[PDB]
């Protein structure tokens, strides 16, 4: 049983380390930092949005990985 509780703030960890599982998950290489990344900064913006604007709940992808359930 993997649960993790963070604060509206804190959620911050939980966006990251989710985006390193599914970037993971797939298998992508290690290779530098690229230019088109700057444009990826869109998608971001939704999440970003979400959570400034505190209106982020809480969600699980699998029972086995790593959960983060929101505490708000």
Avoid: C, W, Y
Avoid at 15 to 24: E, G
């Amino acid at each position: 049983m993997d649960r993790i509780f963070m604060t509206r703030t804190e959620a911050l960890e939980f966006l990251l380390k989710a985006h390193q599982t599914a970037v993971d998950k797939i298998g992508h290489p290690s290779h530098k930092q690229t230019p088109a990344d700057h444009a990826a900064i869109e998608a971001l913006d939704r999440l970003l949005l979400d959570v400034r604007a505190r209106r982020v709940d809480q969600f699980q992808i699998n029972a086995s990985a790593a959960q983060i359930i929101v505490t708000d």
